[PDB]
Design a protein around this ligand. Structure first.
Ligand SMILES: N[C@@H](CC(=O)O)C(=O)O
Ligand code: NA
Ligand code: NA
Ligand code: NA
Length: 415
């Protein structure tokens, strides 16, 4: 009885109730010194929610790209393929430098007290540029899928989808029949994961309550007291300028920006709370069909950008890099400035759709400039931003969904 009424209630309204209620509970318990109780009991519910999101990432990226590539003729795929990737990279480059310019302009936040605390080990070492490019080709298609390789999975999935299109045009009857059966089985898998995503989203209000309450109990209230500069800079930076960057581009091509945000408003809110771009992928598909985009375009452009187009994460890479540098007191000249821009674009590509990938992947960007994590002072500052990661995680996922959706609208208008 009561279980049913909990279901028909709209999902988005439930999340805001959980997020707001979680905020109140965390502050009260933290003030009375019950943080230890929250860590032992409340936290495990939040941990389960995170593990559910990581489960869906790989079965959905492989299946969606195979179906997306197989639904476009090879001639049309080349034209849309080159245009979508160039938009993705250029906005990524602009996103990194946008954080760079105002980080110098805004207060760097050098003044901070640090303690050794916990230390990270084995800092991520950057291989030579030729080596990371040759690793896109999977030496074992099954091994890359099982061993948590994302970039090789995309490379193999796209080729497999293109090869199926050639088979469905073959003269032999047996070849066509077997090619259709293979595509249907993969398509059925892709549709199944969308149903599981809806099922997981029903547990999200409980999961968001645990994750949010845990933050303020330990250190969440400290954002206003200290480190207000780093949290304000990303919010004044990532949210504001990039949304109007979308506004001007749509105006140039003749599309009204205010109509775009109204139709896609639900996409940002679901990405704001669940922290996963891949988890919100089915919602973006629902938005696209109502907007009027043809089926062939967004069926392929949207899945590809869920792992490639991540402007929010790229911006976050630049601002956090200076925060580590300012804490150490070191100074970076233009030579390190260029290296940050290049590595941040590469680093944003390597991240997956899981929420917490931003912090772990950031080791590549810092190591390129220097200051390895073996330094306890570097580790001390690095281990601190992990606490405020959850609050800043929400901003990064939100804009990435719009950045993916913005490109499809621009591209689809061209044809
Ligand atoms: N969850 C982000 C990635 C990150 O936060 O590192 C995204 O997929 O857009
Ligand atoms: Na981009
Ligand atoms: Na990525
Ligand atoms: Na994205």
């Amino acid at each position: 009885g009561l279980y049913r009424k909990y279901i028909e209630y709209p999902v988005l309204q439930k999340i805001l109730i959980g997020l707001i209620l979680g905020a109140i509970v965390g502050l009260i318990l933290g003030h009375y010194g019950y943080a230890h109780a929250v860590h032992t009991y409340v936290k495990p519910f939040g941990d389960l929610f995170v593990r559910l999101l990581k489960m869906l990432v790989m079965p959905i990226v492989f299946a969606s790209l195979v179906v997306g590539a197989a639904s476009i003729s090879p001639a049309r795929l080349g034209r849309v393929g080159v245009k979508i990737v160039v938009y993705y990279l250029l906005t990524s480059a602009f996103a990194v430098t946008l954080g760079i310019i105002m980080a110098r302009l805004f207060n760097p936040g050098a003044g901070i007290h640090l303690a050794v605390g916990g230390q990270q080990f084995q800092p991520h070492q950057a291989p030579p540029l030729v080596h990371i490019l040759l690793d896109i080709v999977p030496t074992n298609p099954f091994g890359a899928l099982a061993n948590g390789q994302v970039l090789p999975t995309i490379f193999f999935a796209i080729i497999l989808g293109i090869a199926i299109t050639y088979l469905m045009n073959s003269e032999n009857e047996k070849v066509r029949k077997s090619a259709e059966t293979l595509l249907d089985a993969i398509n059925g898998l892709a549709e199944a994961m969308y149903k599981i995503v809806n099922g997981v989203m029903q547990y999200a209000p409980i999961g968001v309550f645990a994750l949010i309450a845990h933050v303020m109990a330990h250190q969440g209230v400290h954002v206003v007291g200290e480190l207000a500069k780093v949290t304000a800079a990303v919010y004044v930076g990532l949210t504001l300028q990039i949304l109007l960057v979308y506004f001007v581009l749509l105006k140039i091509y003749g599309i009204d920006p205010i109509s775009f945000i109204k139709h896609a408003k639900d996409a940002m809110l679901t990405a704001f709370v669940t922290s996963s771009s891949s988890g919100t992928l089915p919602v973006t598909m629902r938005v696209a069909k109502e907007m009027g985009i043809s089926e062939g375009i967004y069926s392929f452009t949207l899945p590809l950008g869920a792992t490639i187009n991540m402007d929010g994460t790229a911006l976050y890479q630049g601002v956090a890099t200076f925060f580590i540098a300012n804490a150490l007191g070191s100074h970076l000249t233009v030579g390190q400035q260029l290296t940050i821009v290049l590595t941040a674009v590469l680093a944003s590509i390597g991240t997956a759709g899981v929420p917490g990938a931003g912090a772990i992947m950031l080791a590549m960007v810092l190591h390129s400039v220097g200051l390895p994590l073996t330094d306890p002072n570097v580790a001390a500052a690095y281990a601190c931003i992990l606490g405020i990661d959850a609050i800043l995680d929400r901003g990064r996922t939100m804009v990435n969904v719009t950045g993916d959706l913005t490109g499809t609208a621009i591209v689809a208008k061209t044809e």
